[PDB]
N, CA, C and O atoms as a Tinker XYZ file with bonds, in Angstrom:
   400  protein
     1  N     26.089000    6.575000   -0.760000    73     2
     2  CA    26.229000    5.111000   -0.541000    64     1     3
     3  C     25.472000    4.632000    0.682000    63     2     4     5
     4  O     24.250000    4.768000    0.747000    81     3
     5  N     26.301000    3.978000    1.818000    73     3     6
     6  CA    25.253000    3.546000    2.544000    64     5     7
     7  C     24.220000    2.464000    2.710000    63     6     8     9
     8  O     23.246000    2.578000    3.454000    81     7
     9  N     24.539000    1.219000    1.842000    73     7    10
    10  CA    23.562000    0.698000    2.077000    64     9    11
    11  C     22.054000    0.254000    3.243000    63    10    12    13
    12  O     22.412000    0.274000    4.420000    81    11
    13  N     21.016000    0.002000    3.114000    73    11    14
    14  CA    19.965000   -0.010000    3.861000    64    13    15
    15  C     18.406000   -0.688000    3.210000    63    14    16    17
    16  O     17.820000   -0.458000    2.152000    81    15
    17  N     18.123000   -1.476000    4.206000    73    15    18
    18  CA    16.978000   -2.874000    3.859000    64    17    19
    19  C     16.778000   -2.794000    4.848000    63    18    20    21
    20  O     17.621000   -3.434000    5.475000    81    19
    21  N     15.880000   -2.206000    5.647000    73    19    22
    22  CA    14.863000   -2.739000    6.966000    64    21    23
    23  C     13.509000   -2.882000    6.819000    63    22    24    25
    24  O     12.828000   -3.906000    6.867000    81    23
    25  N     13.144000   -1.552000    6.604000    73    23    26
    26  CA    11.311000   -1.465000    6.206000    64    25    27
    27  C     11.008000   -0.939000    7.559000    63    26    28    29
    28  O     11.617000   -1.234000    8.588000    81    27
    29  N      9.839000    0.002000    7.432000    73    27    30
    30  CA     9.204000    0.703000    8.352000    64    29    31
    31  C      7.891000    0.205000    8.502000    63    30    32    33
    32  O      7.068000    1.086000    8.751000    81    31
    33  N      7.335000   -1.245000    8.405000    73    31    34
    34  CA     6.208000   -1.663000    8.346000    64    33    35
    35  C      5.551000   -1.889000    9.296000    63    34    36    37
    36  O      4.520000   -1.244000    9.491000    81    35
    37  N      5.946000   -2.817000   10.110000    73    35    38
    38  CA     5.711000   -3.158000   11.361000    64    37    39
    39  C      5.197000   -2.164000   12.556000    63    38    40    41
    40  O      4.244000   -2.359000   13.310000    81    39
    41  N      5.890000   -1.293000   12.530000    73    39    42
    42  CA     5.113000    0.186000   13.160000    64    41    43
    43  C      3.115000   -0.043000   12.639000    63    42    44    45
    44  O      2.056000    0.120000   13.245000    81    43
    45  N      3.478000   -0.467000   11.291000    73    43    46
    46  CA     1.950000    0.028000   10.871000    64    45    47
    47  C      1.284000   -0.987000   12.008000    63    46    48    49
    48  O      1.867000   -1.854000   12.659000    81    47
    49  N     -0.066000   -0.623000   12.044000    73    47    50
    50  CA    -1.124000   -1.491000   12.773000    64    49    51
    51  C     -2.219000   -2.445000   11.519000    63    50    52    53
    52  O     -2.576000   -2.382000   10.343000    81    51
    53  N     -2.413000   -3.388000   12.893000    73    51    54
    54  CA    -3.435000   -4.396000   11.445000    64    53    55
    55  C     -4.427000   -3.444000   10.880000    63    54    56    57
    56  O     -4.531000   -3.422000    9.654000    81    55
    57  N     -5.466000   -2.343000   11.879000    73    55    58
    58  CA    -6.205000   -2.138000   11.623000    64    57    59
    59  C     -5.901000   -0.989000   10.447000    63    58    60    61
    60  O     -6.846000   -0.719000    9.706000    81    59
    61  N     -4.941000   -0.468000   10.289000    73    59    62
    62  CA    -4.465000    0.693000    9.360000    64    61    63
    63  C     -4.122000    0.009000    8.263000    63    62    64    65
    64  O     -4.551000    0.609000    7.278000    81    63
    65  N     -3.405000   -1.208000    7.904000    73    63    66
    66  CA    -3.072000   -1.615000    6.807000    64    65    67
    67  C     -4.600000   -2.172000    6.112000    63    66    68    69
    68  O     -4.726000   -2.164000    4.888000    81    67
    69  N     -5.979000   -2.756000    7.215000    73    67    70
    70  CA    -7.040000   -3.385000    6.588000    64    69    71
    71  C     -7.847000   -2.978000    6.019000    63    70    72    73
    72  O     -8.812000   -3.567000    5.533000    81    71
    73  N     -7.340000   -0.964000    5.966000    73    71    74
    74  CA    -8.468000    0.150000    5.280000    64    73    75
    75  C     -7.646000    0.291000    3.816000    63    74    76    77
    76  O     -8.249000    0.992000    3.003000    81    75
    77  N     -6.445000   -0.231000    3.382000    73    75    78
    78  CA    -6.039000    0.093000    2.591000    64    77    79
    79  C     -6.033000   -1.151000    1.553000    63    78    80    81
    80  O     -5.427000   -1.213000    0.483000    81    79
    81  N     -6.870000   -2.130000    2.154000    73    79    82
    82  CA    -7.292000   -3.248000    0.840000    64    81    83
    83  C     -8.789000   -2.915000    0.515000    63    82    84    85
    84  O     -9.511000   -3.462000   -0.319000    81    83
    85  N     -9.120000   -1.754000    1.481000    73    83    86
    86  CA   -10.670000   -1.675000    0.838000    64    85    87
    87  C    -10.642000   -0.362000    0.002000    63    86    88    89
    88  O    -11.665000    0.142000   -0.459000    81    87
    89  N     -9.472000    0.120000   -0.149000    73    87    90
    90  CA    -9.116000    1.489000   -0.870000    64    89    91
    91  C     -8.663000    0.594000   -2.492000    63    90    92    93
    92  O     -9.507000    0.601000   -3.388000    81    91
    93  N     -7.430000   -0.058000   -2.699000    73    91    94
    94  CA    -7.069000   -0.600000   -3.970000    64    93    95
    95  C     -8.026000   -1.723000   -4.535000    63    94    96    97
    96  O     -7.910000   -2.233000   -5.649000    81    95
    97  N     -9.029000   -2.042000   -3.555000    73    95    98
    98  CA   -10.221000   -3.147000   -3.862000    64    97    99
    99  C    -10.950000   -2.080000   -5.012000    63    98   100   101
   100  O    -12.053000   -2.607000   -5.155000    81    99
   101  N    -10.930000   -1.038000   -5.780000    73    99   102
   102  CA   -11.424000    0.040000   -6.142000    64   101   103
   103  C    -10.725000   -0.505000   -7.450000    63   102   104   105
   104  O     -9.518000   -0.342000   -7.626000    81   103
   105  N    -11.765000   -1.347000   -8.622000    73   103   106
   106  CA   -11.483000   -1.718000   -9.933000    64   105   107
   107  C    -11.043000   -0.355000  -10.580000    63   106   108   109
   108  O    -11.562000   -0.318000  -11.696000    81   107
   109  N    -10.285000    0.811000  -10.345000    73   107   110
   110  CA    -9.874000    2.016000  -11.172000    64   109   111
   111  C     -8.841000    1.784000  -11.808000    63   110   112   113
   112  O     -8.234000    0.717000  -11.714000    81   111
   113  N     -8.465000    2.815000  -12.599000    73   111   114
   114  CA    -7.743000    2.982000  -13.307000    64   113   115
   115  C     -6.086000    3.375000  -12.458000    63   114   116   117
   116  O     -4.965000    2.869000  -12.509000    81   115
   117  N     -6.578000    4.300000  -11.865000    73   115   118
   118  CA    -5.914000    4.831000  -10.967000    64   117   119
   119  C     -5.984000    4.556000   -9.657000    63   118   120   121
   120  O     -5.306000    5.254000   -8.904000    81   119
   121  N     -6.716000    3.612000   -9.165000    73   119   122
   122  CA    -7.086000    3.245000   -7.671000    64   121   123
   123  C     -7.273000    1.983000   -7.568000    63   122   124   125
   124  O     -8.153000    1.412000   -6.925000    81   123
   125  N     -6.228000    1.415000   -8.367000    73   123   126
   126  CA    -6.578000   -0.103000   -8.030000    64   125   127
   127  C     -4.907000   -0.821000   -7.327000    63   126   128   129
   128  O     -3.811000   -0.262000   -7.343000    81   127
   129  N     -5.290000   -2.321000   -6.718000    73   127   130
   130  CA    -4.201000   -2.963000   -5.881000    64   129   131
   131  C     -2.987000   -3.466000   -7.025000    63   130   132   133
   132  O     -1.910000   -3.816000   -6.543000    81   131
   133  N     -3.179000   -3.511000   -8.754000    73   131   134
   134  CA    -2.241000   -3.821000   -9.678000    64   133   135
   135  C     -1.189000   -2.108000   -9.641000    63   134   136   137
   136  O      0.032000   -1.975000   -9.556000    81   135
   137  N     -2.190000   -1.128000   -9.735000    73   135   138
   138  CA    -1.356000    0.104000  -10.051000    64   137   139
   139  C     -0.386000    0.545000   -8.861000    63   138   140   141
   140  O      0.603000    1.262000   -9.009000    81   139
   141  N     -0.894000   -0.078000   -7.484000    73   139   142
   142  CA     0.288000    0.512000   -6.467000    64   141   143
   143  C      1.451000   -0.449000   -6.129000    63   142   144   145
   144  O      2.411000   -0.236000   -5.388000    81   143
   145  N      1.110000   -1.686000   -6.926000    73   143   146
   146  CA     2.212000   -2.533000   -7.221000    64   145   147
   147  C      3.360000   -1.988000   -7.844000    63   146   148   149
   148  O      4.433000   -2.002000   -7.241000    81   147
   149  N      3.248000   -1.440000   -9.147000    73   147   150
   150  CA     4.396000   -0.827000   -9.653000    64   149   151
   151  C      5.042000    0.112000   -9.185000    63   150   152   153
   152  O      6.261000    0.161000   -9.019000    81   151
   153  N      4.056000    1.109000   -8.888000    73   151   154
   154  CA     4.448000    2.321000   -8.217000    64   153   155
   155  C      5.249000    1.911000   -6.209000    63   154   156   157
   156  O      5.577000    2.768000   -5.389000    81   155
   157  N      5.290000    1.013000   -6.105000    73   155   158
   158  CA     5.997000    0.451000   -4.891000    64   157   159
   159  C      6.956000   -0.424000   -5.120000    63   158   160   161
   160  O      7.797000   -0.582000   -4.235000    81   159
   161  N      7.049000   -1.191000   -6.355000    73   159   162
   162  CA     7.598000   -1.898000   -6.398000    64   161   163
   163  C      7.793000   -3.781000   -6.799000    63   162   164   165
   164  O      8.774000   -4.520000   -6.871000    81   163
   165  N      6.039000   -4.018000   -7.019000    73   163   166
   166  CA     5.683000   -5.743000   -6.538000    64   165   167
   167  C      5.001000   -5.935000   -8.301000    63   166   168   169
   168  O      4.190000   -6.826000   -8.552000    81   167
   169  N      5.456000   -5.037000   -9.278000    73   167   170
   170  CA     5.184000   -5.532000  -10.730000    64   169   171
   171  C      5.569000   -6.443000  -11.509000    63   170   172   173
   172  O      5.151000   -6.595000  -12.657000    81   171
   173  N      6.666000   -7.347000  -10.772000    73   171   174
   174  CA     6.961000   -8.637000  -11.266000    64   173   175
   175  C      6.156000   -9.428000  -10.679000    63   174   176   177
   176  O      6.046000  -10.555000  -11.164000    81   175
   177  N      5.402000   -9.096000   -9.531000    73   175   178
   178  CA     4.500000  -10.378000   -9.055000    64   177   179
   179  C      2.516000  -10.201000   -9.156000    63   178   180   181
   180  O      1.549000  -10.761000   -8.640000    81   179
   181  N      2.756000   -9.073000  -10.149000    73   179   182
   182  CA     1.841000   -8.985000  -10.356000    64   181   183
   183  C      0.865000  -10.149000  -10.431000    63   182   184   185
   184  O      0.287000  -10.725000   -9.510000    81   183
   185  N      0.818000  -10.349000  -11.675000    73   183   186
   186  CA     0.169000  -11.689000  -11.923000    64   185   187
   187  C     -0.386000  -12.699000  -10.988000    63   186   188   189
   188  O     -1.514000  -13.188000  -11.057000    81   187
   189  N      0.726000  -13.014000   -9.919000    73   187   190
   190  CA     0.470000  -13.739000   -8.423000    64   189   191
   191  C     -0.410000  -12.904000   -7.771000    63   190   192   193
   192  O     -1.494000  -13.327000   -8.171000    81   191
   193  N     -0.575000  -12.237000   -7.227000    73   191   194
   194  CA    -2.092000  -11.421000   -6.834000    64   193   195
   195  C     -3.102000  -11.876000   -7.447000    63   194   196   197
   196  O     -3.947000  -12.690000   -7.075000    81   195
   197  N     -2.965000  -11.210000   -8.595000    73   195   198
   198  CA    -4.392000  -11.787000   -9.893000    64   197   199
   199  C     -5.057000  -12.699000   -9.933000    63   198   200   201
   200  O     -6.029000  -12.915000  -10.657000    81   199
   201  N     -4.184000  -13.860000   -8.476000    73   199   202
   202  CA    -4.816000  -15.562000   -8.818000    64   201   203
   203  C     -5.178000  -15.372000   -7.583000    63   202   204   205
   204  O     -6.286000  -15.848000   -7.336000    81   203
   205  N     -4.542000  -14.739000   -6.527000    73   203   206
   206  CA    -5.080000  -14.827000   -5.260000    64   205   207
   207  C     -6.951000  -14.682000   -4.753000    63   206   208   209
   208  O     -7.890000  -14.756000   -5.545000    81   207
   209  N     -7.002000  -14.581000   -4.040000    73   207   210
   210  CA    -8.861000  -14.340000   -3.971000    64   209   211
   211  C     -8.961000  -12.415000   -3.561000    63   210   212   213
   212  O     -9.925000  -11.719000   -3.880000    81   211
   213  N     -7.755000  -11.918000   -2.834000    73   211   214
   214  CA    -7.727000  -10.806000   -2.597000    64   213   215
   215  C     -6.231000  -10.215000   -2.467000    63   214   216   217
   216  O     -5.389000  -10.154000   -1.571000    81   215
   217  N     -6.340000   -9.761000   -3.983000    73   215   218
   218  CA    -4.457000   -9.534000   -4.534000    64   217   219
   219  C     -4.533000   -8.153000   -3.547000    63   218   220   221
   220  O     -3.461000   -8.064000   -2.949000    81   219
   221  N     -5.300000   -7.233000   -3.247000    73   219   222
   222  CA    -4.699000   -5.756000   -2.749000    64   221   223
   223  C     -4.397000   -6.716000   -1.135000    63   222   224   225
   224  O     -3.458000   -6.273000   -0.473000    81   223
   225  N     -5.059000   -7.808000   -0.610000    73   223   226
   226  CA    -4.392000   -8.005000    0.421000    64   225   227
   227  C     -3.079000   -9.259000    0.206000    63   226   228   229
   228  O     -2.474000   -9.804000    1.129000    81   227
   229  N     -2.964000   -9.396000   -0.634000    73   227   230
   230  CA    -1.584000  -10.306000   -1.074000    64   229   231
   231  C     -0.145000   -9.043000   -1.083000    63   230   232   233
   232  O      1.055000   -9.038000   -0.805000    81   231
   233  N     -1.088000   -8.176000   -1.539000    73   231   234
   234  CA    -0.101000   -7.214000   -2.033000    64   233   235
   235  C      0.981000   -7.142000   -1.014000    63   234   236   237
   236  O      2.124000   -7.574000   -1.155000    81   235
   237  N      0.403000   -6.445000    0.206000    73   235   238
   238  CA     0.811000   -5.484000    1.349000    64   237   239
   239  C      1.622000   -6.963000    2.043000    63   238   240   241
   240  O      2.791000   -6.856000    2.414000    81   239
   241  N      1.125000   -7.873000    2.129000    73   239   242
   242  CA     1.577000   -9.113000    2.633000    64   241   243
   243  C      2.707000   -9.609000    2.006000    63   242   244   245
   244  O      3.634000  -10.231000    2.523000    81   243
   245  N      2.551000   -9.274000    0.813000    73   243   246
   246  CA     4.000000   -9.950000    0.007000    64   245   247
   247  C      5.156000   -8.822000    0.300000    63   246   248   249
   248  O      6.346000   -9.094000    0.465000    81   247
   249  N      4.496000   -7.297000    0.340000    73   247   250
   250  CA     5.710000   -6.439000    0.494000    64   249   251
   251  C      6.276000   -6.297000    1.759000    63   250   252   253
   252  O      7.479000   -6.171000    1.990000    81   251
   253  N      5.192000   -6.326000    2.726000    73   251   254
   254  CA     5.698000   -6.477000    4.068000    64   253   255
   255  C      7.139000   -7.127000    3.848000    63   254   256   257
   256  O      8.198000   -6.510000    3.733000    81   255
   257  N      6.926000   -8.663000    3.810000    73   255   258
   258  CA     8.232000   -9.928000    3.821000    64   257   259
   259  C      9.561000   -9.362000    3.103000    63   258   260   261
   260  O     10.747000   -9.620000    3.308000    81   259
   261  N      8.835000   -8.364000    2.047000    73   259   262
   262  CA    10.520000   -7.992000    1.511000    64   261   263
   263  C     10.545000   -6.484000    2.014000    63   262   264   265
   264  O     10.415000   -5.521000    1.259000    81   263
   265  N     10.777000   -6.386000    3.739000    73   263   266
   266  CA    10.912000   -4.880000    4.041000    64   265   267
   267  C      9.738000   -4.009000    4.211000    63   266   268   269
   268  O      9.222000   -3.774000    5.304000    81   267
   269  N      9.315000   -3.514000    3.012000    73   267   270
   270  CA     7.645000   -2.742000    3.401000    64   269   271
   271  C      8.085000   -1.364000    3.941000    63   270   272   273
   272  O      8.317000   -1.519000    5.139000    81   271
   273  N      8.316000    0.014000    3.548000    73   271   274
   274  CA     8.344000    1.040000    3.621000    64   273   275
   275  C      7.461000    2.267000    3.880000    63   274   276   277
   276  O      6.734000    2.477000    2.909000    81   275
   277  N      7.310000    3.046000    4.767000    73   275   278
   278  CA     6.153000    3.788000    4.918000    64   277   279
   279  C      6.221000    5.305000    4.166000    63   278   280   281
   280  O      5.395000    6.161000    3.851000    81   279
   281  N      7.626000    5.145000    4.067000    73   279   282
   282  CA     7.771000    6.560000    3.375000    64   281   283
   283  C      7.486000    6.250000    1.356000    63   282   284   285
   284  O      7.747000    7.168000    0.578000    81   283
   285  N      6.942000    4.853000    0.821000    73   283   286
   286  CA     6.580000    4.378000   -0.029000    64   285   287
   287  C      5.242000    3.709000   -0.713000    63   286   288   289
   288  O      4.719000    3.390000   -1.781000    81   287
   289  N      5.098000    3.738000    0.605000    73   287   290
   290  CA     3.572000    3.542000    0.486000    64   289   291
   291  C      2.931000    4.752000    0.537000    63   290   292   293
   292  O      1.858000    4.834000   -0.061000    81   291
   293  N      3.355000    5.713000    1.122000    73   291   294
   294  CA     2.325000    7.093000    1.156000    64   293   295
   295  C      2.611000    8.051000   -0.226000    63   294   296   297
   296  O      1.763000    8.756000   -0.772000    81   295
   297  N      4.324000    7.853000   -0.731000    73   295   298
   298  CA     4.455000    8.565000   -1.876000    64   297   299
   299  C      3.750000    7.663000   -3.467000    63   298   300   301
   300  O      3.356000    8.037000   -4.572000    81   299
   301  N      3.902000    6.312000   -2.742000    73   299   302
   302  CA     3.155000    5.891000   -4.091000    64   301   303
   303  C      1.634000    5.734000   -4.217000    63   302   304   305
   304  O      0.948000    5.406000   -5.185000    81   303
   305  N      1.363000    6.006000   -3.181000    73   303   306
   306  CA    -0.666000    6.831000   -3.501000    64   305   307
   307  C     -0.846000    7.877000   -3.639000    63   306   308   309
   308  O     -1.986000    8.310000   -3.805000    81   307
   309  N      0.580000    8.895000   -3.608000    73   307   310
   310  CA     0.247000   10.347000   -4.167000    64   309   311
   311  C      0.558000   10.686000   -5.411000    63   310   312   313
   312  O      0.190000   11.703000   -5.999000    81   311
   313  N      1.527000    9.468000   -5.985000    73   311   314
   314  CA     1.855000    9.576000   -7.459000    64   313   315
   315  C      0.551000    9.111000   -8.346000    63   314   316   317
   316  O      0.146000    9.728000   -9.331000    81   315
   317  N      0.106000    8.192000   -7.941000    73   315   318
   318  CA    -1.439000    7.482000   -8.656000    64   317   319
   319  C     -2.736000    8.702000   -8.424000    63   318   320   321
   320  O     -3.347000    9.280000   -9.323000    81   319
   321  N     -2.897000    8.846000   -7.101000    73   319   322
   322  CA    -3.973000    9.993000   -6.874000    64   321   323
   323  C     -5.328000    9.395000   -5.620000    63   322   324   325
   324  O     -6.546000    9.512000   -5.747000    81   323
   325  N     -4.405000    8.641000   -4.249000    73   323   326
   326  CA    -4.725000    8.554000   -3.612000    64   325   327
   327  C     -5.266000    9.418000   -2.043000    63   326   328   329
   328  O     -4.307000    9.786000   -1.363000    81   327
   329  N     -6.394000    9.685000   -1.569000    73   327   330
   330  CA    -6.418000   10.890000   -0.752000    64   329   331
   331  C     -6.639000   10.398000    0.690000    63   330   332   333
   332  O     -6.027000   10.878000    1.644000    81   331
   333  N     -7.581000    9.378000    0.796000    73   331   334
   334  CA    -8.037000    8.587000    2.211000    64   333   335
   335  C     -6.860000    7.686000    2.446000    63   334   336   337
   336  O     -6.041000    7.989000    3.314000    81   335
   337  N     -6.715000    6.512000    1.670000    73   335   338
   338  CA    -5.312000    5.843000    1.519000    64   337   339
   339  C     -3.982000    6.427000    2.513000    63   338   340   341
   340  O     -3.251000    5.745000    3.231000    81   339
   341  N     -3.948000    7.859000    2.296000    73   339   342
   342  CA    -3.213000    8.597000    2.774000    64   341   343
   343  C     -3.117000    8.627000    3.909000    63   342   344   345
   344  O     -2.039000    8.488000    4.487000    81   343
   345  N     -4.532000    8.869000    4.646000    73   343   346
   346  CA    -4.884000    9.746000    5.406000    64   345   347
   347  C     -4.731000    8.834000    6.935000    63   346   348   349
   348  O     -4.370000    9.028000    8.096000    81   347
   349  N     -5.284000    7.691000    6.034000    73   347   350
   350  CA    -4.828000    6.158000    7.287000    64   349   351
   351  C     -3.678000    6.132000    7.939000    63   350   352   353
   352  O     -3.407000    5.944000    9.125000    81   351
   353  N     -2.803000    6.425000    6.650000    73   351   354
   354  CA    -1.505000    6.044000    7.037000    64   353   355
   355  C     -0.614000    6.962000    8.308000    63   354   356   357
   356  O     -0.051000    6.665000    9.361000    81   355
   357  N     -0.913000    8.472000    7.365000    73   355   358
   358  CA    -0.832000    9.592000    8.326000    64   357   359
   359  C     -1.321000    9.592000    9.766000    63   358   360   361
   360  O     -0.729000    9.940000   10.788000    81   359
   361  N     -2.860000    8.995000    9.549000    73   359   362
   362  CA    -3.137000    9.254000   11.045000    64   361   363
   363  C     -2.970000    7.817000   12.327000    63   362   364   365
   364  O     -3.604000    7.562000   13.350000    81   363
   365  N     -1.868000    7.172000   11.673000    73   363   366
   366  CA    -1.386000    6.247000   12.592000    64   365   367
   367  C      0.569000    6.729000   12.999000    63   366   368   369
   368  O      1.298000    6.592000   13.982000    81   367
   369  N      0.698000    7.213000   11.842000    73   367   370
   370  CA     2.178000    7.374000   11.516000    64   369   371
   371  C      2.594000    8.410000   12.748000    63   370   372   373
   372  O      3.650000    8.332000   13.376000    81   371
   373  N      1.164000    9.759000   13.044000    73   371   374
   374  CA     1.950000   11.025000   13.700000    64   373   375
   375  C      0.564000   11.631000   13.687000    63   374   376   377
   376  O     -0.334000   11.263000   12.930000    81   375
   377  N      0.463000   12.633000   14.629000    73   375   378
   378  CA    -0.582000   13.398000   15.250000    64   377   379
   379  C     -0.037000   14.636000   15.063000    63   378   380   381
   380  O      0.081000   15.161000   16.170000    81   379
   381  N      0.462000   15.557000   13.945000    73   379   382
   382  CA     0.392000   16.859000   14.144000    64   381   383
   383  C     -0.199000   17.834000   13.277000    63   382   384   385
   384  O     -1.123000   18.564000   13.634000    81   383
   385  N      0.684000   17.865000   11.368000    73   383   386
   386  CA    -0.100000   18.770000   10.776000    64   385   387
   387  C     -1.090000   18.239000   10.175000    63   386   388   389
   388  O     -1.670000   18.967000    9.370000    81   387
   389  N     -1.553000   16.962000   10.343000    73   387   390
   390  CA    -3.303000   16.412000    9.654000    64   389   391
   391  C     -3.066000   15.323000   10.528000    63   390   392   393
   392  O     -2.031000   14.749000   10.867000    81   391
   393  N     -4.539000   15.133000   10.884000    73   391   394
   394  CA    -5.018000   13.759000   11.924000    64   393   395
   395  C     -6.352000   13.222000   11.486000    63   394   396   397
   396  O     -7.173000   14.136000   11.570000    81   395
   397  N     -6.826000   12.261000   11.110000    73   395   398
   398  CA    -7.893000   11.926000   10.886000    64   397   399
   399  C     -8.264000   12.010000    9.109000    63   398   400
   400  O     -9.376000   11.683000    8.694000    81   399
């Protein structure tokens, strides 16, 4: 039980979240800003991105406001098949078993 709603976002930095709209900016199948919607959580607002001018940066912006998780953002680019994405995150998050 336990309930819990904070989000670990804010820790992130601008410059770490601004490498990860040029990562889902990636028209893939598997590497795009619609697919880490679901896999995080923002697939009802899909569509709202879609109209925006830059939905992978609507994305992170819309999830931020509801909380924004870091331990969710890194597992849901490893479920899709994200590797740099990662690596941002990691190397702002902690300096020990991978940096850079």
């Amino acid at each position: 039980g336990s309930s819990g709603s904070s989000g670990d976002m804010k820790q992130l930095a601008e410059d770490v979240k601004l490498q990860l709209y040029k990562l889902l900016e990636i028209p893939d199948p598997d590497k795009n800003w619609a697919t880490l919607a679901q896999k995080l959580g923002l697939g009802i607002l899909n569509n709202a991105f879609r109209l925006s001018p830059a939905p992978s940066k609507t994305l992170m912006d819309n999830y931020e406001v509801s909380g924004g998780t870091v331990r969710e953002l890194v597992e849901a680019l490893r479920q899709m098949g994200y590797t740099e994405a990662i690596e941002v995150i990691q190397a702002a998050s902690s300096s020990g078993p991978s940096s850079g």
